[PDB]
Design a protein around this nucleic acid. Structure first.
Lengths: 59, 117, 138, 156, 113
RNA sequence: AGCGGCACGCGAGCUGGGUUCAGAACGUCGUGAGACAGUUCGGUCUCUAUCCGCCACGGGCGCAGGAGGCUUGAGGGGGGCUC
RNA sequence: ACCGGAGCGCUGUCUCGGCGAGGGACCCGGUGAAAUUGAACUGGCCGUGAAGAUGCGGCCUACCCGUGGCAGGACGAAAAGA
RNA sequence: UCGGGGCUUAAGCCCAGCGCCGAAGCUGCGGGUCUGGGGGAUGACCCCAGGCGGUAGGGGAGCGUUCCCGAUGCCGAUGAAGGCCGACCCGCGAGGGCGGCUGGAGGUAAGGGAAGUGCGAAUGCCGGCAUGAGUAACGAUAAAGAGGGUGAGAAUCCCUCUCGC
RNA sequence: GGUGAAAAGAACCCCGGGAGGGGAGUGAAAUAGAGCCUGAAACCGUGGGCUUACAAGCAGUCACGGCCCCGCAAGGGGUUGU
């Protein structure tokens, strides 16, 4: 609300394009060594664990 | 004596819907822009029927002129000959009797100059 | 009946001289051939007009004072970006251009109108890529 | 109409510096529950029908029934106590059936009693006597006296 | 067969959760779930919830086996919208739109023969 | 120590000093309310750019085997003073 | 806390601006407005037009879409022109 | 920059003869329209004649609507009304009809009558949803760290330990 | 403002914190499932067909080609390459 106003209603086309560059990006995961399942690259999954395994305390 | 609007405009406006559903734009949905497009299309249809007429005259005369200079000379002289040959019409359209069968045309070209010349 | 529309004919190639010729007058002929106006079954929306390899365009003739007068122009979107070159200098440095410019403007403007420009190869030689047929013309 | 609405007659937003339209009173039609423009108010559709004309009216109408042949003025109705099946057997005997409806013209109330609840036979009688009846229906079943009341209707 | 978990009357505009969904549309259970956990959204919670109710149906209602069970159509549609009234300068009763939505993980076994 | 065009360029960029606001005074005209191409002093231009335009930055693609690095310069932009 | 004019000391008012600082903005994360809104598939010269065009025309640069930023045009929004 | 190009014994200039394009003007065709003549008493209908753009507007005709007489009746669960689909038939036309899918109990012929009748607008009245834009803002520049407990869920509650107004 | 003739107004299993649903069970019917007969329009989604990444747009129109799907034929829808 000022001087530079959206003079006209923008089309559905523009809606979908400005929202074309939107989108998501999928997660990135690898396995957990000395374990079984995933862990994102460079992590110490609580269930699993990096080298030496720290924490791992859940139920 | 009630005159509640009812559903007449429903049926009618949606008649305009199907009458113009297929176009582009919000107008290809918008009841009041759509109709304006209906005007566009119909008016266009009229003007384009007459356009179509002249257009086709052209096309014929195009390929005809090509073949006529090919196996002879310019199209104007071919006409000139055939109006003098009195070969009523030939249908410049069916002067595409050159499009198929070379000898038919070619012969009628020799007839063209045969008349005047 | 119902006017006939050509099938996918095989594009015929052609070769043209150049030297001693008149620029405009030359192209004048080129164009009508880039399209099917020479062929009996010419069709508007198709592109089936002969390809045209032109030789030694480096020696095309031009009347009047063109040589020194005629000035081609190009405009870069930039301020004072107008660039105008005389027909005289167009020959010296890459002259096969002159014939092209001359023709391009003598063809439709639409999509295929540039599509047909592609059908024309011009060489400041003679000499071409002896691709095939290429029956010289007059 | 608009004046008989328990609303105001006062403006809400101004005149020029408004940004919206201009009216104010939520009473005129233009708004939501506005009043009506003229029309639907209580009235009387009636008028005057000249004597002579309407006299002939009955005549013509009634007499036109007579042109067909569907008519009669029984001397006296046999069903003398006003009970349904009396007039019913009476009617089956008097040229009647069931599919034919009766401006049943007559004046003895008792005969009309069966006719008071008569699902085909409207029960038409004399001091009312109209043309719309004889057109809408079927049987001039005249007691001699109903026709008497009619003979004086014209009488000129 | 094909299992379905659907819910209406539930939070978040179609935008963000749609973003979450189509990142995982037509993906197997294990994969898609490994996504659901490692998601920097609340679509993690919502989508994984409905997805899980979807997984369980196939376990003991539709019968398919989850080694084979991957996710088909996930539709996500908008319910009503909360028309909240916020205040603002010079005295406008702002309207603020809280669009509510409709998530639907469908799914099925792997092969057909 | 140029003459000129482009809303005598450029207040969705500044300045609001000059301008024709109500206040007040003054010269002046009018019987007076008030007004005078007469003066005086002070006196609220309003942050989010929608398309275009432009200044850089990318993504997706394309270059009719996939790829890594060295490159051509058609075009085009910058550059030109003087004592 | 009234309007001119002049000198003294002082200073980023100016030459000519450079660095830094916290906070907005920019990336992620949770939510989410507005006035305007016929539709738009919306570039430029030279003319055209009731006098000032992407849209008409003889004609221009350029793949599709986006992000940061500047503010010239859409006779720019605020008004049914003070 | 002639519109553009691209022309120099011309693609310019003026002057003569023949050619051809190119207008819904015209010929042809054939369907509808009104007015004159005629065949048919003939009404219906056909044959000959011409005009066949038009804001205000004058004049005529038609489709559609809510209801009333017809209606103590006619229609209908094999399914009222309306809702949605049609590439189908009838009307020049607004429409009529008919079939497909729905929904669940109303609809009214041929003649006739009457009126809140036909909406695209009025910076239109009410409802409904987007556009802007996942952007601005998330209200003091007095500031927050952890360990644990809690609990489906914790930076955000809670316990303590700390630091700052 | 209207579920149904009437509440028969949905136990028990399942995921889930609940919410809400997936089944079952009910009635003629749950496209009558609890502000629930009807459910359209603008309207926001998901699948599929045709089309789009050298291109100048009141967005259509006339013709022709590509195409996909209805079609006995003949044709018809559709869509857009020029």
């Amino acid at each position: 609300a000022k001087h530079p106003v959206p003079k006209k209603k923008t089309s559905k086309a523009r809606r979908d394009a400005r929202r074309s560059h939107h989108a998501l990006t999928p997660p990135t995961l690898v396995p957990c060594p000395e374990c079984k399942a995933m862990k994102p690259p460079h992590t110490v999954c609580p269930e699993c664990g990096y080298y030496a395994g720290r924490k791992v305390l859940e139920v | 004596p009630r005159a509640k609007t009812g559903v007449v405009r429903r049926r009618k406006h949606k008649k305009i819907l199907k009458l113009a559903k297929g176009y582009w734009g919000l107008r290809s949905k918008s009841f009041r822009k759509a109709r304006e497009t209906l005007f566009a299309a119909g008016n266009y249809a009229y003007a384009h029927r007459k356009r179509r007429k002249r257009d086709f005259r052209r096309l014929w005369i195009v390929r005809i002129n090509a073949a006529c200079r090919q196996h002879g000379l310019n199209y104007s002289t071919f006409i000139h000959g055939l109006k003098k040959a009195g070969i009523e019409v030939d249908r410049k359209n069916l002067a595409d009797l050159a499009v198929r069968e070379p000898q038919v045309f070619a012969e009628l070209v020799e007839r063209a100059k045969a008349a005047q010349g | 009946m119902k006017t006939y529309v050509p099938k996918q004919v095989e594009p015929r190639w052609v070769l043209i001289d150049a030297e001693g010729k008149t620029l405009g007058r030359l192209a004048t002929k080129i164009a009508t051939l880039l399209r099917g106006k020479h062929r009996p079954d010419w069709t508007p929306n198709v592109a089936m007009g002969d390809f045209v390899v032109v030789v030694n365009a480096d020696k095309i003739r031009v009347t009047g004072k063109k040589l020194e007068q005629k000035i081609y122009t190009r405009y870069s979107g930039y301020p004072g970006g107008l660039k105008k070159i005389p027909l005289e200098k167009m020959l010296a440095t890459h002259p096969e251009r002159v014939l092209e410019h001359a023709v391009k403007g003598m063809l439709p403007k639409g999509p295929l109108g540039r599509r047909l420009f592609k059908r024309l190869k011009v060489y400041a030689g003679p000499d071409h890529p002896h691709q095939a047929q290429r029956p010289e013309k007059l | 109409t608009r004046g008989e609405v328990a609303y105001s007659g006062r403006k809400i937003w101004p005149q020029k510096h408004t940004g919206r339209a201009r009216h104010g009173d939520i009473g005129a039609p233009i708004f939501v529950g506005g009043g009506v423009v003229f029309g639907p108010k209580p009235r009387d559709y009636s008028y005057t029908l000249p004597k002579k004309v309407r006299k002939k009216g009955l005549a013509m109408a009634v007499a036109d029934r007579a042109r067909e042949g569907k008519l009669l003025l029984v001397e006296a109705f046999a069903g003398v106590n006003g009970k349904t099946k009396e007039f019913l057997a009476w009617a089956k005997e008097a040229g009647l059936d069931g599919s034919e409806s009766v401006l049943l013209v007559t004046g003895n109330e008792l005969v009309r009693r069966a006719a008071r609840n008569l699902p085909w036979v409207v029960t038409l009688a004399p001091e009312g006597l109209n043309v719309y009846d004889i057109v809408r229906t079927e049987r001039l079943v005249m007691d001699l006296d109903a026709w008497e009341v009619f003979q004086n209707r014209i009488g000129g | 067969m094909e299992a379905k978990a659907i819910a209406r009357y539930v939070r978040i505009s179609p935008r963000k959760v749609r973003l979450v969904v189509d990142l995982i549309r037509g993906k197997s259970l294990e994969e898609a779930r490994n996504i659901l956990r490692y998601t920097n959204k609340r679509g993690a919670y919502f989508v994984a919830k409905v997805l899980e109710s979807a997984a369980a149906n196939a376990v003991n209602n539709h019968d398919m086996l989850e080694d084979r069970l991957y996710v088909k159509a996930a539709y996500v549609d908008e319910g009503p919208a909360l028309k909240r009234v916020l205040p603002r300068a010079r005295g406008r009763a702002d309207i603020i739109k809280k669009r509510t939505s409709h998530i639907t993980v469908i799914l099925g076994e792997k092969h057909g023969k």
